[PDB]
Amino acid sequence: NFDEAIVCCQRHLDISRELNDKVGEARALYNLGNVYHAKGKSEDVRNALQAAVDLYEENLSLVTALGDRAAQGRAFGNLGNTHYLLGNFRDAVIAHEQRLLIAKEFGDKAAERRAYSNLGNAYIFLGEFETASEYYKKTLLLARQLKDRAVEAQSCYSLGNTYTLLQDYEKAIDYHLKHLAIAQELKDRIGEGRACWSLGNAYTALGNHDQAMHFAEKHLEISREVGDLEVLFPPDEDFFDILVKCQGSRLDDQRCAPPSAATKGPTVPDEDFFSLILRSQAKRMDEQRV
Amino acid sequence: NFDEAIVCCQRHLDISRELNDKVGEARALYNLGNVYHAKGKSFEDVRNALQAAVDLYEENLSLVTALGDRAAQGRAFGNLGNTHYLLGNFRDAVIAHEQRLLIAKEFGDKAAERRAYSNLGNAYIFLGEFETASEYYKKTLLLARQLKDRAVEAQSCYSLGNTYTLLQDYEKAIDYHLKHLAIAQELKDRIGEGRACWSLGNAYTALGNHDQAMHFAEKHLEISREVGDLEVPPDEDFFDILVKCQGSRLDDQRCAPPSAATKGPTVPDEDFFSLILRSQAKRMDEQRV
């Protein structure tokens, strides 16, 4: 519906400019940035996304002239997310950083946490894993204070992936187990299949074939059943149960559900860096080769 | 991630063909059809992704049929219905979902039965066959109650609401949307509430009840206002914009960022507000002389 929508906001903005309506112009700019933003995630896509950024940044300066701190916040947060989708992790960070500060001013714990969590993701893409674990830990402490079991599990998972990248599999396992617990606790099956792969992949890197073998099987069982699924209660498009079983010619256990049933559990983080991890130890295997 | 994924399934399929592995070939075909399917709704060369998925699912189907797995045939049929639906082949959609319903009936699968009735209703709505569509929505409504599913229940009511509105029976339309508005409030689905309110206030308008119309429009307006300021099921129908696109009274357009752009549990898969909008738009111009 992205085209009917865009014309409408254009109409709205058109009018607001004619009427010298500073508020409504800013709103139309936000609305129009939101549509583009959503078009951008559904490489002339870069055109939709750069528009959204342009639009949000215009709105920002305006809502700043007005002086609405919450409304500046909404733009900053959107800017973080758009830049993030574009690769401008540099700019992502700058924008989310403000967003965290504005959540701090309002004492917004949920928005504080989301921002730490967002910042973490950006730092991971920058390869700055040390500075990223710093934020994930922050987001973890907040989740507990927020009494949010779900997010809690996500920060654990996210910290898991982090340390795995640092090649500290001892702390990685610690975190994923904490997450595997909340998964079971909250009965998030899809999240369970995720931990199990992760764990079984960490242990592998430790030489614990015994424990690795175990988890791979737990993952295999859950994998098997979510393939036969046709519906599920968050659009998981990372093709996890296929990518993760793409090694050599032992491929019989690739699984993938239809888009309807392709949802991520409440304990899976926004970003799961399995493929990075995968590609990253792939690089090192070849580096040892001589 | 759609490209790494496709080559993997391709590898898998390649191998399964080499090994004369009939099961694994069918599985690779399903996996490959699922990736395309998902590419099709996220990346009009899209028609290429979607027609592939169909081709892929149809191959798999004949194969799983050779094997004789009724549940696995079922998964393909259901996918086929959904892919055709996305393509416009509402004809083909129906044929495929029909089987799916029958297969859910064989297994006594009430949840799958219901989803299929509901899917069939959507297809018939796009065919302009609104009479035959209310027939299915009513089926899906009875099942929801039997399933004890308050959420779906509200969705069938909402869906029936839109249906009758198209039939220009605003009296029954209102009845259904009110039933839905109740469950919405009951289950505290705010976003769903703003939907009912618009719908109702739009129906009443068509009845001449300015009094009640004016009411709901205000309830909708209040919810609308607050979900725009929000920051955290991908609702991409731009409802709170499209619905306020009449004349130059546009100050109340609202739209949330993608993160916060989720649909409530009582909003149906398909909300036909735009059809309704465009449909009474056609008639306004038709009366003009």
From Swiss-Prot, chain A:
**Which compartment or compartments is the protein found in?**
Cytoplasm; Cytoplasm, Cell cortex; Cytoplasm, Cytoskeleton, Spindle pole; Lateral cell membrane
Q: Which domain of life is it from?
A: Eukaryota
Domain GoLoco residue range list: 236-258, 270-290
Stated consequence of mutating residue 99 to A: Abolishes interaction with NUMA1. Abolishes interaction with FRMPD1
Q: Which windows of the sequence hold TPR repeats? A: 26-55, 73-106, 113-146, 153-186, 193-226
Q: What is the effect of changing residue 284 to A/G?
A: Reduces affinity for GDP-bound GNAI3 50-fold. Reduces affinity for GDP-bound GNAI3 500-fold
For GDP, which residues are the binding ones? 250, 255, 284, 289
According to UniProt, the tissues expressing it are described as: Detected in brain and liver (at protein level). Detected in brain, spleen, liver and testis, and at lower levels in heart, lung and kidney. Enriched in the ventricular zone of the developing central nervous systems. Expressed in proximal colon, ileum, ovary, Sertoli cells of the testis and granular cells within the cerebellum.
Q: What is the effect of changing residue 114 to A?
A: Abolishes interaction with NUMA1. Abolishes interaction with FRMPD1
Q: Where is this region: Important for interaction with NUMA1?
A: 1-228
Name the family.
Belongs to the GPSM family.
Briefly, what is this protein's role?
A: Plays an important role in mitotic spindle pole organization via its interaction with NUMA1. Required for cortical dynein-dynactin complex recruitment during metaphase. Plays a role in metaphase spindle orientation. Plays an important role in asymmetric cell divisions. Has guanine nucleotide dissociation inhibitor (GDI) activity towards G(i) alpha proteins, such as GNAI1 and GNAI3, and thereby regulates their activity.
Give the record's subunit note: Interacts with the dynein-dynactin complex; this interaction is inhibited in a PLK1-dependent manner. Part of a spindle orientation complex at least composed of GNAI1, GPSM2 and NUMA1. Interacts with LLGL2. Interacts (via TPR repeat region) with INSC/inscuteable. Interacts (via TPR repeat region) with NUMA1 (via C-terminus); this interaction is direct, inhibited in a PLK1-dependent manner and promotes spindle pole organization. INSC and NUMA1 compete for the same binding site, but INSC has higher affinity and can displace NUMA1 (in vitro). Interacts with GNAI2.
What free text does the record give on domains? Each GoLoco domain can bind one GNAI3. In the auto-inhibited conformation, the GoLoco domains interact with the TPR repeat region.
Q: What is this protein called?
A: G-protein-signaling modulator 2
Report which part of the complete sequence is shown: 117 to 648 of 679
Curated annotation (Swiss-Prot), chain B:
Q: As annotated in Swiss-Prot or TrEMBL, what is the tissue specificity of this protein?
A: Detected in brain and liver (at protein level). Detected in brain, spleen, liver and testis, and at lower levels in heart, lung and kidney. Enriched in the ventricular zone of the developing central nervous systems. Expressed in proximal colon, ileum, ovary, Sertoli cells of the testis and granular cells within the cerebellum.
Q: Which residues form the GoLoco domain?
A: 235-257, 269-289
The annotated consequence of residue 162 to E reads: Abolishes interaction with INSC
Task: Please give the residue ranges the record annotates as the region Important for interaction with NUMA1.
Answer: 1-229
TPR repeat locations: 26-56, 74-107, 114-147, 154-187, 194-227
Sites binding GDP sit at 249, 254, 283, 288
User: Which consequence is recorded for altering residue 126 to E?
Assistant: Abolishes interaction with INSC
Subcellular location field: Cytoplasm; Cytoplasm, Cell cortex; Cytoplasm, Cytoskeleton, Spindle pole; Lateral cell membrane
Q: Which domain of life is it from?
A: Eukaryota
Consequence recorded when altering residue 82 to F: Nearly abolishes interaction with NUMA1
Question: What is the recorded phenotype of mutating residue 115 to A?
Answer: Abolishes interaction with NUMA1. Abolishes interaction with FRMPD1
Q: So what does mutating residue 276 to E actually do?
A: Disrupts one GNAI3 binding site
UniProt effect for mutating residue 288 to A: Reduces affinity for GDP-bound GNAI3 500-fold
Q: What does this protein do?
A: Plays an important role in mitotic spindle pole organization via its interaction with NUMA1. Required for cortical dynein-dynactin complex recruitment during metaphase. Plays a role in metaphase spindle orientation. Plays an important role in asymmetric cell divisions. Has guanine nucleotide dissociation inhibitor (GDI) activity towards G(i) alpha proteins, such as GNAI1 and GNAI3, and thereby regulates their activity.
By sequence similarity, the record places it as follows:
Belongs to the GPSM family.
What does UniProt say about this protein's domains?
A: Each GoLoco domain can bind one GNAI3. In the auto-inhibited conformation, the GoLoco domains interact with the TPR repeat region.
Quaternary assembly: Interacts with the dynein-dynactin complex; this interaction is inhibited in a PLK1-dependent manner. Part of a spindle orientation complex at least composed of GNAI1, GPSM2 and NUMA1. Interacts with LLGL2. Interacts (via TPR repeat region) with INSC/inscuteable. Interacts (via TPR repeat region) with NUMA1 (via C-terminus); this interaction is direct, inhibited in a PLK1-dependent manner and promotes spindle pole organization. INSC and NUMA1 compete for the same binding site, but INSC has higher affinity and can displace NUMA1 (in vitro). Interacts with GNAI2.
This protein's name: G-protein-signaling modulator 2
